Amino acid sequence: LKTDEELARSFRQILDLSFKVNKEISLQSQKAVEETCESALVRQWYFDGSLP
Amino acid sequence: FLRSLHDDSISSSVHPGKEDLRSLSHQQWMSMAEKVWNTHTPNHILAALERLTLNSTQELKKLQFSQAADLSKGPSCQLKEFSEPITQSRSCNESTHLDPQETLPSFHSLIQEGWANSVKVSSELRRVQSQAQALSEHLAERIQEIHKKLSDGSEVSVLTRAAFDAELRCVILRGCRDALMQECRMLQEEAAGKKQEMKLLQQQQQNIQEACLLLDKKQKHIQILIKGNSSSKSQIRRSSVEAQKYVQDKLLPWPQE
Amino acid sequence: GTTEDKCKEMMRLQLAYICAKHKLIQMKAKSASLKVGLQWAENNASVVQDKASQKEENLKVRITSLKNETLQIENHTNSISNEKLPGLVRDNAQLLNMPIVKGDYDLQMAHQTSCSSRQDLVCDHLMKQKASFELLQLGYELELRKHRD
Amino acid sequence: KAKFESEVLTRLRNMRHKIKREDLVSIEKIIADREREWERKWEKILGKCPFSLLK
Amino acid sequence: ALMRMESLEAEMEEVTEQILTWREQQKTAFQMNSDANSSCITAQTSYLSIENLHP
Amino acid sequence: ETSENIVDVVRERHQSKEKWAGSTISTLCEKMKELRQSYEAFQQSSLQD
């Protein structure tokens, strides 16, 4: 009975792990792309149209 | 009668014809009310009102207990199959197909999916980057081969080389432009495909605002009723004192005269 | 987290997506351009020996023409890359929030119903109470009239 | 059989504890540093909070 | 029945390893690209120099 | 009694559908398979690099 409960809990934690890992990888990828591009270009990507 | 006045105040549709019906309904109530006061003794009428008030409090308590249980009722509970069809009793409102009420997803769960999709794009980027590097190396090898065949030192060969490089640059740039346009088309199609969904969300958003405003109206009315019922209670007390004062000041002194 | 934290999180998701998607499309364009370049280079490799027999004056005119065409294509490409593409990507990025917003809306709508239902119950109850008070008030008015007679 | 199943339960618990106390703590720290570095970088370049422009 | 429960536990361990392996692979992949971009900035400058054929 | 209880507990765990992640309802085994396939797909895309 204890093993059955632990199975569900353990799996939710695995899902949380997957999530945080995906977010980590996405932010790293963002950083890698920003370093290869001039900040002015990236600024245009993110914000161009919103600046007066 | 009061409920009808309440519904009309919430539905802004001031239908201009509903006043004559209101009056008739008031008069009908007055007549009936008077009949009641003439047919039954005041002590009996007051007792009846006390009893009716007990019932309202009982119903409120029952609702709270059931409603509070609903707040404390979250889904592990298994669909027990209990049997017997009496009549129908589909729902208090009348029907209840809806309960798909699967636990609406939480922000966390949705946002998790969003980041998973973002990773799919990053993974695709890496794939295409590797492909572009292979192609760039392959193109450099081919250009070098063509340049070696035009190296016969003649002014015409040099010019032919320059013309080649220029034609090649034009083809590459045309290819880049066509590709970017193509990608822009895709992005537009995707956005166009979702435009309907966005309209729908806008409508929902309007609905939420309207219904937020609807809730505000119901609350503003609840405030008015609460204030109105407190004032009526004071008025009844005043009317009771006025009737007693009339009997003491004007009727009781006559037997002596 | 505060609606603010959730919003921030959504925005973060968008920004990460914009950055990645923009680069992806650039790379897709580069890749497609190289492919077409490679295909062209492979098809014109055998014809380049026959063109060497052309009058010097014709090659000069062609190079000049090609240089002018290249500049035009470059200016069009840069316009697409720097003006049209970033706007479209941003629009698409905002659409990432659709399921989250929808989910929230659904949640709100559902919430609105509960408060409104209790509101109606309280209003009707409060109205039932008023009806009882008005009946008693009328009872006192009729009694006062009979005392006057 | 009781001894074996007990071992399975202990393995699951050890796995979950390893994920929660080791793996997620390390990952969450890296995510927080990256989000802060990013916010500082763009705040410097834009003179305002980057998220205000997206609102 | 107990065998089935043991199979679920094994599968959970396997998926957890897969997620962590994937995380490590990506960490290496980003370190290699940062080292290669430092080297490649040097080579690309060379070839566009063929536009300078003036005399 | 114990032998029968254990068979039921395990059966319920294999057949029970819950919202684990996202907007889709699934069993624990299905969601775990989905998650496994996703990371297999991610790993294959990295080896072809």
UniProtKB/Swiss-Prot annotation, chain A:
Highest taxon listed in the record's lineage: Eukaryota
Family label: Belongs to the HAUS8 family.
Section covered of the full-length record: 316 to 367 of 367
Protein's recorded name: HAUS augmin-like complex subunit 8
Region forming the signal peptide: none
Function of the protein: Contributes to mitotic spindle assembly, maintenance of centrosome integrity and completion of cytokinesis as part of the HAUS augmin-like complex.
Phylogenetic lineage: Eukaryota, Metazoa, Chordata, Craniata, Vertebrata
Protein localization: Cytoplasm; Cytoplasm, Cytoskeleton, Microtubule organizing center, Centrosome; Cytoplasm, Cytoskeleton, Spindle; Cytoplasm, Cytoskeleton, Spindle pole
Species annotation: Xenopus laevis (African clawed frog)
Subunit composition and interactions: Component of the HAUS augmin-like complex. The complex interacts with the gamma-tubulin ring complex and this interaction is required for spindle assembly. Associates with microtubules. The interaction with microtubules is strong during mitosis, while it is weak or absent during interphase. It is unclear whether this interaction is direct or indirect.
Swiss-Prot record, chain C:
Superkingdom of origin: Eukaryota
GO biological process, one term: cell division
Keyword flag NAD: no
Cell compartment(s), UniProt: Cytoplasm, Cytoskeleton, Microtubule organizing center, Centrosome; Cytoplasm, Cytoskeleton, Spindle
Keyword Phosphoprotein: no
Keywords: Cell cycle, Cell division, Coiled coil, Cytoplasm, Cytoskeleton, Microtubule, Mitosis
Cellular component aspect of the GO annotation: centrosome; cytoplasm; HAUS complex; microtubule organizing center; mitotic spindle; mitotic spindle microtubule
Main subcellular location: cytoplasm
Coiled-coil regions listed: 41-70
Similarity section: Belongs to the HAUS3 family.
Function of the protein: Contributes to mitotic spindle assembly, maintenance of centrosome integrity and completion of cytokinesis as part of the HAUS augmin-like complex.
Subunit details: Component of the HAUS augmin-like complex. The complex interacts with the gamma-tubulin ring complex and this interaction is required for spindle assembly.
Protein name: HAUS augmin-like complex subunit 3
Provenance organism: Xenopus laevis (African clawed frog)
Gene expressing this chain: haus3
Portion of the full sequence shown: 250 to 398 of 597
